[PDB]
Amino acid sequence: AIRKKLVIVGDGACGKTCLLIVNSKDQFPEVYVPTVFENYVADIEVDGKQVELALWDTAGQEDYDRLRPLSYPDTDVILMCFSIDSPDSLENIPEKWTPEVKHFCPNVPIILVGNKKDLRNDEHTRRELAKMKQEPVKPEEGRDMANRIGAFGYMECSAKTKDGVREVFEMATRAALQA
Ligand SMILES: Nc1nc2c(ncn2[C@@H]2O[C@H](COP(=O)(O)OP(=O)(O)O)[C@@H](O)[C@H]2O)c(=O)[nH]1
Ligand SMILES: [Mg+2]
Numbered sequence: 001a002i003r004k005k006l007v008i009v010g011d012g013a014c015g016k017t018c019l020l021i022v023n024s025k026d027q028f029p030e031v032y033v034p035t036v037f038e039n040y041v042a043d044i045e046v047d048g049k050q051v052e053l054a055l056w057d058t059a060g061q062e063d064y065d066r067l068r069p070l071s072y073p074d075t076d077v078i079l080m081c082f083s084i085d086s087p088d089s090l091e092n093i094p095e096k097w098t099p100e101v102k103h104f105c106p107n108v109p110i111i112l113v114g115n116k117k118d119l120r121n122d123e124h125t126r127r128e129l130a131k132m133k134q135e136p137v138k139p140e141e142g143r144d145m146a147n148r149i150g151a152f153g154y155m156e157c158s159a160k161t162k163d164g165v166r167e168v169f170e171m172a173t174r175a176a177l178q179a
Pocket of ligand 1 (some may be wrong): 010011012013014015016017018019033034035036115116117118119158160161170
């Protein structure tokens, strides 16, 4: 099989680890979620090509901020994430994540991923955002951001319901294979 490396980045609590867990174990972690990952090589077949895709999870706060640059060498594809229930997390895409990834991973394809799509029509989420005069991120807003940052594409998923998860990783593998 062809060996490729994926790195996932984005604001704390935007659903990175749960996304990796759901693709790998086919089960949303209902109780315990480790800070990261670590060490899962996905077997993915796309367009008649068997790929081993190493999943490198990352985190924030002092220690994991310090360590995060060590994830970047020899990356073939980046999943850059925000949460659909967090306009703040989308704002950090151009402010923080894009400059960081462009510095360490020039020319590496980026898939921009909107996580927690299940929260888009969630009553509690709507109500909490409405008191801020905010609303969940719209798909067109995600797409606009992907265009702006020069991403390979924009995708949405819910780790919680599993919807769109398989497709995120299939598209990431296609990006890792090219060029
Ligand atoms: N509603 C919803 N919650 C999610 C989803 N994915 C993760 N979460 C929750 O979001 C929180 C952070 O998830 P985690 O994967 O640890 O985020 P990370 O810090 O980006 O790795 C946890 O409480 C998860 O249960 C999702 O798709 N939908
Ligand atoms: Mg995590």
